[PDB]
Design a protein around this ligand. Structure first.
Ligand SMILES: O=C(O)CNC(=O)C(=O)O
Ligand SMILES: [Mg+2]
Ligand code: NI
Ligand SMILES: [Zn+2]
Length: 331
């Protein structure tokens, strides 16, 4: 069995190997990359996502989210307080302000220390889930706006024809902005490209051990657990690496830098934070191996998780028993 310790793998495809997305994902899985839950892909040196970022300040962040934490330094929840719209120009200025800027630090490890020590005492502002793309339409390889759609994958594999579309989202981050422990909707893959700015640190639990994380989360957030049988779908809970080590939960960590892709694999729980002002683009995708994960994915039916139009059809076709109850939550 390849990669039995479920380490995060890093790949360096040639320009030739960068032509066929699906084939390279299948290659990475042949080498066991999926066992980690997360892989890094460093694009060939000849590739570029777009010519410059010189004009990005005019993007609107219609609903910036202030991420307010509650709990203790290693075990907390975050709630998203909606703020007034601001441009990326305005946001970048805010990220760089004394109140919000990255502190002096020695290296990534010192900054990670400072994050886990001090995150709860600040409320950074995140521009998340902004429909759009920063890839140039002339970028033919690994252009997150030109992937084959999940609906097309389901049609090709299963013959069914469903409504829905699949488009990318932009994330504008600052120091301490945080993504809580989650898997993707319907335990899909994700791919994330860091277009610009400061790094993003990731933590991941191997898919084969995801239930160990869920059991810990139920113990650590016991009222949330009683409210909903899939409350990690709410995307609000944080658990530090120190806490995970204390409870014997297998995980790995890696820092993504500007110009690099990360892939998360089905049912790979992940969480992380941004080091400073940055812009990422991400999208969900499917392969044939996903289908079985889609059929088994947990669902939030308490009504908190509230998700896209396109998820309806996935639940309807892959989880018909759950469909009625899940849609009562969605309505
Ligand atoms: O970049 C972020 O804030 C969060 N991204 C993801 O969870 C992902 O790409 O799957
Ligand atoms: Mg602009
Ligand atoms: Ni994700
Ligand atoms: Zn719920």
């Amino acid at each position: 069995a390849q990669n039995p310790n479920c380490n995060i793998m890093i790949f360096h495809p040639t320009k030739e190997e960068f032509n066929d997305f699906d084939k390279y994902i299948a290659y990475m899985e042949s080498q066991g990359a999926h066992r980690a839950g997360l892989a890094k892909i460093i694009p060939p040196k000849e590739w570029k996502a777009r010519e410059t970022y010189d004009n990005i300040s005019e993007i609107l962040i219609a609903t910036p989210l202030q991420q307010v934490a509650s709990g203790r330094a290693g075990v907390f929840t975050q709630y998203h307080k909606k703020k007034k719209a601001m441009t990326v120009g305005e946001y970048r200025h805010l990220a760089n302000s004394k109140k919000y800027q990255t502190p002096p630090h020695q290296n990534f490890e010192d900054l990670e220390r400072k994050y886990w020590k001090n995150r709860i005492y600040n409320s950074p502002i995140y521009g998340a889930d902004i429909s759009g793309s920063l890839f140039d339409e002339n970028t033919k390889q690994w252009n997150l706006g030109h992937l084959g759609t999940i609906q097309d994958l389901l049609e090709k594999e299963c013959g069914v024809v469903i409504e829905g579309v699949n488009t990318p989202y932009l994330y504008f981050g600052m120091w301490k902005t945080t993504f809580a422990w989650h898997t993707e909707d319907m335990d899909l893959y994700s791919i994330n490209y860091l277009h610009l700015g400061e790094p993003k640190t990731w933590y991941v639990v191997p898919p084969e051990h995801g239930q160990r994380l869920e059991r810990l989360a139920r113990e650590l957030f016991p009222g949330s657990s009683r409210g909903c049988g899939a409350f990690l779908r709410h995307k609000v809970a944080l658990i530090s690496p120190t806490v995970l080590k204390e409870n014997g939960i297998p995980f790995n960590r890696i820092t993504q830098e500007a110009g690099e892709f990360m892939v998360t694999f089905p049912y790979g729980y992940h969480a992380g934070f941004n080091h400073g002002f940055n812009c990422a683009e991400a999208i969900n995708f499917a392969t044939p191996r996903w289908i079985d994960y889609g059929k088994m994915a947990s669902q939030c039916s308490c009504g908190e998780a509230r998700v896209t139009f396109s998820m309806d059809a996935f639940v309807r076709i892959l989880q018909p028993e759950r469909y009625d109850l899940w849609k009562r939550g969605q309505d």
